[PDB]
Write a protein that binds this ligand. Structure first.
Ligand SMILES: *[C@@H]1O[C@H](CO)[C@@H](O[C@@H]2O[C@H](CO)[C@@H](O[C@@H]3O[C@H](CO[C@H]4O[C@H](CO[C@H]5O[C@H](CO)[C@@H](O)[C@H](O)[C@@H]5O)[C@@H](O)[C@H](O[C@H]5O[C@H](CO)[C@@H](O)[C@H](O)[C@@H]5O)[C@@H]4O)[C@@H](O)[C@H](O[C@H]4O[C@H](CO)[C@@H](O)[C@H](O)[C@@H]4O)[C@@H]3O)[C@H](O)[C@H]2NC(C)=O)[C@H](O)[C@H]1NC(C)=O
Ligand SMILES: *[C@@H]1O[C@H](CO)[C@@H](O[C@@H]2O[C@H](CO)[C@@H](O[C@@H]3O[C@H](CO[C@H]4O[C@H](CO)[C@@H](O)[C@H](O)[C@@H]4O)[C@@H](O)[C@H](O[C@H]4O[C@H](CO)[C@@H](O)[C@H](O)[C@@H]4O[C@H]4O[C@H](CO)[C@@H](O)[C@H](O)[C@@H]4O)[C@@H]3O)[C@H](O)[C@H]2NC(C)=O)[C@H](O)[C@H]1NC(C)=O
Ligand SMILES: *[C@@H]1O[C@H](CO)[C@@H](O[C@@H]2O[C@H](CO)[C@@H](O[C@@H]3O[C@H](CO[C@H]4O[C@H](CO[C@H]5O[C@H](CO)[C@@H](O)[C@H](O)[C@@H]5O)[C@@H](O)[C@H](O)[C@@H]4O)[C@@H](O)[C@H](O[C@H]4O[C@H](CO)[C@@H](O)[C@H](O)[C@@H]4O)[C@@H]3O)[C@H](O)[C@H]2NC(C)=O)[C@H](O)[C@H]1NC(C)=O
Ligand SMILES: *[C@@H]1O[C@H](CO)[C@@H](O[C@@H]2O[C@H](CO)[C@@H](O[C@@H]3O[C@H](CO)[C@@H](O)[C@H](O[C@H]4O[C@H](CO)[C@@H](O)[C@H](O)[C@@H]4O)[C@@H]3O)[C@H](O)[C@H]2NC(C)=O)[C@H](O)[C@H]1NC(C)=O
Ligand SMILES: *[C@@H]1O[C@H](CO)[C@@H](O[C@@H]2O[C@H](CO)[C@@H](O[C@@H]3O[C@H](CO[C@H]4O[C@H](CO)[C@@H](O)[C@H](O)[C@@H]4O)[C@@H](O)[C@H](O)[C@@H]3O)[C@H](O)[C@H]2NC(C)=O)[C@H](O)[C@H]1NC(C)=O
Ligand SMILES: *[C@@H]1O[C@H](CO)[C@@H](O[C@@H]2O[C@H](CO)[C@@H](O[C@@H]3O[C@H](CO)[C@@H](O)[C@H](O)[C@@H]3O)[C@H](O)[C@H]2NC(C)=O)[C@H](O)[C@H]1NC(C)=O
Ligand SMILES: *[C@@H]1O[C@H](CO)[C@@H](O[C@@H]2O[C@H](CO)[C@@H](O)[C@H](O)[C@H]2NC(C)=O)[C@H](O)[C@H]1NC(C)=O
Ligand SMILES: *[C@@H]1O[C@H](CO)[C@@H](O)[C@H](O)[C@H]1NC(C)=O
Ligand SMILES: [Ca+2]
Ligand SMILES: [Ca+2]
Ligand SMILES: [Ca+2]
Ligand SMILES: [Ca+2]
Lengths: 589, 297, 325
């Protein structure tokens, strides 16, 4: 709810380049600056003879700079015999970053066999750990042809573990059975050799080939990491959307010896159960939880007609090994809710992680919507607390696809709150939404006495029936915010009487039914309270002694004086921002 | 006198933070307060024998020789059996996660010679499984010991078994020893006051409601984190007189510690070296070289 | 609080340099023109390989310790003459002419842990260790529960107090005994542990190497060649704190005062003239910036009211000692 939609950062790349197809963060060595990593897989580069090689750009929080992963053209196997084809390789289709490491891949990279003249899409990745740039093509092997890893398209999806292992998905391996490959980063760079086209890694973990019934399964279509067998080693989660006769499945493998741990299965044919997956602990139990998107899920409408809305299943991990699974249906028809799932960390710093789910084709003009969901003790809140709307219309070709890729859980502005990058490759754009600080306010209101006598003269005046109004105010926040929060408080006596009626209350010295007061209070210290005297009008001035006198107290914030150096204005917690009211009565008999 | 006044204001901010409190609470008796909590306070100061917040200390006494403690045991003159009720344990500490430290304390009487003691746990209400061990010294005065059974108490609060207990026999040479008297009350306090009680230290529900290289190397900390540092002898020192090793990960602690608190290492590891002395090779081990963890104190 | 460098790492390196030399009680590196390049015996490589194996379990403790080991006596001598091997116990024997030769004076001995070799034992076992008294009697030492290791495991038992007593007597023959747990009050017994032994019957050419990895006693002693409060340095100063006097808090009944000390004093390093002399107190951690920090702390129990009196205990309050690290 606290994402700043008033002043978001708009980053742009070359038009038609699908700029924003993959997004991620960049946090290098020590306490340095932070960057946005954006993929543009159809982007023309300066590579000799390479048309639309693609690139990954480093943007500053505010110009963007291309990252030089590879400046060379197509290597030759022999004279007039090109070894590789980097044109239209879609480099930057998936970008994943861990500390000072940036991993980008080219899923549509084709490579000619070293036995004969083929053009097989084995896929390749480039890894940059500071200065050294290495190549990584675990599917570029001697296991050629569709039967092997020739059509693997390694690097279609990637992720990092907490133990410096890379997780790579290859949906085309073994006649499109798919394959997961995991290599230690110490081995990737050490065993790299620009003169060796098929490097064999000893600590490689891979899903070996199975029976022919499992062909055309697309294992490795999406990936995510998290511990599930309760050992400490990040395990491999991957969607298998065409498995189970187009029902869609998700396989879980152990991250130590590549063994199957748990299975999930879609519940509707061709719902693409497994298009996107994510792993993050959502209910504060230190057990990573599985989020599976099925953007093509069709549910039944109220009228009995089917409607494609997409579905995400939420599976809560338990120590007993089981899973508590629920299902979250999309809101808009054909929006493909569940196309992208980005763990956000604790977006609002409430003690429970939160998550974003995108419907890249929802909203007006099919521009795109991103829904923000908050965690709680019982799991994920099914109702979204914030709606991110796309602003960019569809020129021609692909729709804007706002939300198609996203990544969270990184506080890029050191504001105390993790922020969120949202890609929209159809309009070549990426947008940074900054989390606004959340102010929790506890307001109080005491009215003593409750019963106002018709003639109780006590407070000094040259004396009329008067009473004390004591209102207390306390505020706090959890992040990087200033101490002094300036509040504007308004009080209205006897509001129930609309403008034009007969009023019956007004402050003692202000001589005015309303009293304004500018209030600087400090968060965290103590509750600052203030008393003041208001009185009732004489009996003969109004015959209306039946209309209960409601004391109304309203409070607001300045925001401008509570903003940050970056102009990020805080925001109140959503269920408890309101003003409060109480009342006193005149009795008889 | 100015040096001492700065620490006091840090103690003020520490105690309130340890209680997770911003301000102290807001009477009776004009005489001495109840000796039920003075028995706890006299039992907490009596020491013969991460988590910086406070722990609420409560205790529970054992069951007399009545209440069915006798139809099962009673006569093994070389042992002592102790039993407790779970209906009162899960009331001082509701959630097993709140339990932090649970040490079982007894009371010694015999002062002459020495004995060897083995401790067991109650399983299947008939079988006993080994726990810990401790040798005893002839102290001329009554001494108070304690056995850390936190791991045992934690599992018992998760179970609905309303009857549990412990067993204290002597050494088994593979012959019974330890308790040479058959009254069972000569060596320890039976059926009297100051009888064995289980001292508990848990965290209130009001509260709940130092990582090492496994976190400091996978994340970029701005605070007191242990940074990586591989020290080579030939490269960073110019020492070719040390055969093994020829380089190691000593690391260091760098980082701030706010609420002068410094980033000091908490856990260190020794390093074995191999060097020659003229013609005599000596394999020696240096103490505390590899910095594992780092703390702020 | 000013930008900071990567030179902090070099401050550690130059503190390590002076540290290693001080723990070895050396002023300059020794001569290596008296050392022959090439020969690296596999006898000292087994020592170094056993010291890197860390089995889970004052002024003289900061200096270096010369690590030497001694293997045991085989079952081909004396170990079969009285008892041999049985399911009830396992016997290991050592000499003394080599124990008091690696550590001549019994005082030099610092830590002496006896290390063995486990085999896969799966579920559960319990082991008790004994010492040889006089010749006839055996006395308890320690005990240890066993975990289901599917792979060969290496253990270690701190028998320092035993070896020191063995170095004081001229007893030319010593040894240990390894039986198992004794379930008593009702009588049960047996041993099921598979430790690397002799098996008695392995012969041939490879039989000679089947005596390797046998139980050995790792020793860590101080070489014979070494032998031998007034708030100047980092010392802990006295400070008595009263609650009514120094805090003005009447809401805490007990206690009514305690001694909360503090650490005052500088901790510098690599000073002119040099020092390599006082290195055990100035910077024993060899850190880039040594601070006078407390090393040992003690908790404090408190008593306060809220209708429910709660007895609580605070962690880390009383400062005992102060170090530079
Ligand atoms: C979650 O769900 C998923 C999906 O269901 C599940 O993952 C699959 O789990 C099933 C469980 O059974 C796995 O099925 C097993 O697959 C084994 C395959 O590996 C070997 O077997 C190959 C068999 O060859 C087939 O084809 C030939 C004809 O070509 C035919 O004659 C055979 O009978 C067989 O059908 C074998 O060829 C292959 O060998 C390779 O390498 C050699 C060189 O060594 C080379 O010469 C070969 O050419 C080949 O390249 C490979 O080694 C299979 O062996 C195994 O067999 C068991 O079941 C049968 C039937 O019950 C028994 O008769 C047999 O004795 C075995 O017990 C079994 O069928 C499937 O592979 C998984 N898919 C994966 C991992 O992608 C997860 O397990 C689920 N999760 C959980 C927790 O359950
Ligand atoms: C005291 O300790 C020292 C070292 O601390 C030791 O010297 C070393 O001995 C070990 C024997 O275990 C040697 O390790 C072997 O290495 C070869 C090849 O290694 C090459 O590369 C190294 C660089 O690291 C070079 O220095 C070296 O000269 C070689 O060129 C391996 O082939 C050995 O076997 C492995 O493969 C087998 C399959 O054939 C496996 O079955 C076996 O498990 C071995 O490990 C493999 O599997 C492991 C999983 O279980 C996996 O984790 C491993 O990575 C590997 O894949 C063997 O490992 C080592 O080279 C020696 N060091 C030097 C500098 O020479 C002393 O011998 C020792 N003294 C004693 C015991 O008395
Ligand atoms: C590839 O790697 C995987 C894992 O990385 C290996 O799978 C392992 O298999 C071994 C069997 O060889 C299992 O060990 C057994 O443990 C039993 C005791 O339970 C312990 O493990 C629990 C695991 O956690 C549980 O919860 C999670 C949910 O979080 C579940 O998903 C999971 O399935 C478990 O149910 C711990 O939680 C628990 O606290 C225990 O520590 C033992 O009883 C068992 O047999 C022993 O005892 C036998 C006789 O009693 C004896 O004969 C045997 O030799 C053995 O000693 C065995 O030890 C591992 O638990 C299991 N891993 C995991 C993560 O569960 C797989 O073997 C490996 N493959 C290869 C080829 O290397
Ligand atoms: C619970 O703890 C409290 C303290 O927290 C403890 O109070 C102790 O009371 C004894 C008195 O019995 C104190 O000891 C006395 O100290 C003065 C000198 O200051 C002596 O003169 C006293 O004389 C003793 O010796 C006599 C010899 O003829 C005895 O006959 C006579 O009974 C006296 O004991 C005595 O030494 C002691 O100082 C305090 N404790 C502290 C910390 O000050 C109380 O007794 C404890 N209660 C239980 C049930 O454990
Ligand atoms: C006629 O009008 C008179 C004035 O308008 C009324 O006098 C009022 O009488 C009520 C009792 O019903 C008083 O309320 C009490 O106030 C005390 C104040 O003590 C606190 O003071 C400060 C806050 O200012 C606080 O910090 C302290 O710690 C004390 O807690 C409360 O403690 C009591 O609970 C109680 O509410 C009014 O204070 C008093 N008004 C004035 C101006 O003195 C009179 O009651 C009316 N007659 C009727 C209605 O018949
Ligand atoms: C990246 O650069 C390439 C060129 O290096 C761009 O490809 C060019 O695309 C245009 C259409 O967008 C092609 O024009 C066509 O020409 C043919 C004649 O061959 C004509 O018949 C068609 O009707 C059309 O007009 C152009 O040929 C093509 N260039 C090459 C060398 O093939 C590409 O658009 C650039 N992409 C981005 C994102 O900048
Ligand atoms: C004080 O703030 C509350 C907010 O809770 C206002 O209540 C709103 O009232 C309008 C119509 O009366 C409703 O349409 C809104 O839905 C209410 N808000 C909520 C959050 O339910 C109230 O109007 C404010 N006071 C005044 C005088 O305007
Ligand atoms: C308080 O500040 C407001 C501006 O928000 C101003 O209009 C008003 O006059 C101020 N009132 C007082 C009493 O300072
Ligand atoms: Ca795992
Ligand atoms: Ca969870
Ligand atoms: Ca949250
Ligand atoms: Ca932020």
């Amino acid at each position: 709810f606290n994402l700043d939609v008033d002043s978001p950062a708009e980053y742009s790349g070359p038009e038609g380049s699908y700029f924003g197809f993959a997004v991620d963060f960049f946090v290098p060595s020590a306490s340095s600056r932070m960057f946005l990593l954006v993929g543009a897989p159809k982007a023309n580069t300066t590579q000799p003879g390479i048309v639309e090689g693609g690139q990954v750009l480093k943007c500053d929080w505010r110009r963007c700079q291309p990252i030089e992963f590879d400046a060379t053209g197509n290597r030759d196997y022999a004279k007039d015999d090109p070894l590789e084809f980097k044109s239209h390789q879609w480099f930057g289709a998936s970008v994943r970053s861990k500390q000072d490491k940036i991993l980008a891949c080219a899923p549509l990279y084709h490579w000619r066999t070293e036995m004969k003249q083929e053009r097989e899409p084995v896929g390749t990745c480039f890894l940059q750990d500071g200065t050294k740039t290495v190549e990584y093509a675990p599917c570029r092997s001697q296991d050629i042809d569709a039967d092997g890893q020739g059509f693997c398209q390694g690097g279609f999806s990637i992720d990092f573990t907490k133990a410096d292992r890379v997780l790579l998905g290859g949906p085309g391996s073994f006649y499109w059975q798919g394959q997961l490959i995991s290599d230690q980063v110490a081995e990737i760079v050490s065993k790299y050799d620009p003169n060796v086209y098929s490097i064999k890694y000893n600590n490689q973990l891979a899903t070996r080939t199975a029976q022919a019934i499992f062909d055309d399964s697309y294992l490795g279509y999406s990936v995510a990491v998290g511990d599930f067998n309760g050992d400490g080693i990040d395990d491999f989660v991957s969607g298998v959307p065409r498995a189970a006769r187009t029902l869609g499945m998700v396989y879980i493998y152990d991250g130590k010896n590549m063994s199957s741990l748990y299975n999930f299965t879609g519940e509707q044919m061709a719902a693409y159960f497994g298009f996107s997956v994510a792993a993050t602990d959502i209910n504060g139990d230190d057990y990573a939880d599985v989020f599976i998107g099925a953007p093509l899920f069709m549910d039944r409408g109220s009228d009995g007609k089917l409607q494609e809305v997409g579905q995400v299943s939420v599976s809560l991990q338990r120590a007993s090994g089981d899973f508590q699974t629920t299902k979250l249906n999309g809101f808009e028809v054909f929006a493909r809710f569940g196309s992208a799932i980005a763990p956000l960390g604790d977006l609002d710093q409430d003690g429970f992680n939160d998550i974003a789910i995108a419907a890249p084709y929802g909203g007006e003009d099919k521009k795109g919507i991103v829904y923000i969901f908050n965690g709680r003790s019982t799991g994920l809140n099914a109702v979204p607390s914030q709606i991110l709307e796309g602003q960019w219309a569809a020129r021609s070709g692909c729709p804007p696809s706002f939300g198609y890729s996203m990544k969270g859980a990184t506080d890029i502005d050191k504001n105390g709150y993790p922020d969120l990058i949202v890609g929209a490759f159809g309009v070549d754009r990426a947008i940074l939404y900054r989390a606004r600080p959340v102010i929790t306010v506890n307001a109080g209101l005491e009215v003593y006495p409750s019963i106002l006598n018709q003639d109780n003269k006590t407070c000094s005046l040259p004396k009329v029936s008067c009473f004390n109004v004591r209102f207390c105010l306390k505020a706090d926040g959890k992040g990087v915010l200033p101490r002094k929060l300036n509040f504007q408080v308004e009080l209205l006596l006897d509001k129930l009487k609309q403008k034009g009626a007969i009023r019956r209350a007004l402050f003692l010295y202000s001589r005015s039914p309303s009293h304004s007061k500018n209030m600087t209070i400090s968060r965290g210290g103590l509750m600052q309270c203030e008393e003041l005297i208001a009185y009732l009008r004489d009996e003969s001035e109004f015959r209306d002694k039946l209309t209960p006198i409601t004391i109304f107290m309203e409070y607001r914030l300045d925001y401008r004086t509570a903003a940050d150096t970056t102009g990020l204005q805080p925001i109140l917690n959503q269920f408890t921002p309101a003003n409060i009211s109480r009342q006193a009565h005149i009795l008889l008999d | 006198e100015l040096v001492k006044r700065k620490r006091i204001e840090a103690i003020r901010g520490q105690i309130l933070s340890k209680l997770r409190l911003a301000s102290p609470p807001s009477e009776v008796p004009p005489g001495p307060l109840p000796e039920a909590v003075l028995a706890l306070y006299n039992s907490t100061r009596d020491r013969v024998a991460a988590d910086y917040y406070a722990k609420e200390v409560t205790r529970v006494l054992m069951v007399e020789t009545h209440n069915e403690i006798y139809d099962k045991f009673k006569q093994s003159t070389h042992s002592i059996y102790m039993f407790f009720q779970t209906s009162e344990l899960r009331e001082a500490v509701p959630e097993p996660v709140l339990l932090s430290r649970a040490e079982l304390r007894l009371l010694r009487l015999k002062l002459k010679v020495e004995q060897h003691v083995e401790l067991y746990q109650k399983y299947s209400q008939n079988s006993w499984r080994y726990l810990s061990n401790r040798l005893l010294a002839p102290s001329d005065s009554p001494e108070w010991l304690s056995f850390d059974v936190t791991g045992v108490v934690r599992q018992w609060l998760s179970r609905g078994g309303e009857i549990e207990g412990f067993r204290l026999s002597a050494h088994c040479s593979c012959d019974i020893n330890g308790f040479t008297t058959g009254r069972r009350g000569d060596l320890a306090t039976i059926h009297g006051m100051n009888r064995p009680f289980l001292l508990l230290m848990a965290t209130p529900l009001e509260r709940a409601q130092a990582l090492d290289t496994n976190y400091c190397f996978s994340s970029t900390e701005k605070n007191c984190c242990v940074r990586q540092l591989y020290i080579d002898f030939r490269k960073d020192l110019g020492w070719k007189w040390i055969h093994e090793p020829k380089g190691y990960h000593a690391n260091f602690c760098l980082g701030p510690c706010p609420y002068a608190p410094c980033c000091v290492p908490q856990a260190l590891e020794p390093l074995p070296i191999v060097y020659y002395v003229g013609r005599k090779p000596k394999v020696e081990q240096l103490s505390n070289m590899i910095v594992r963890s780092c703390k702020c104190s």
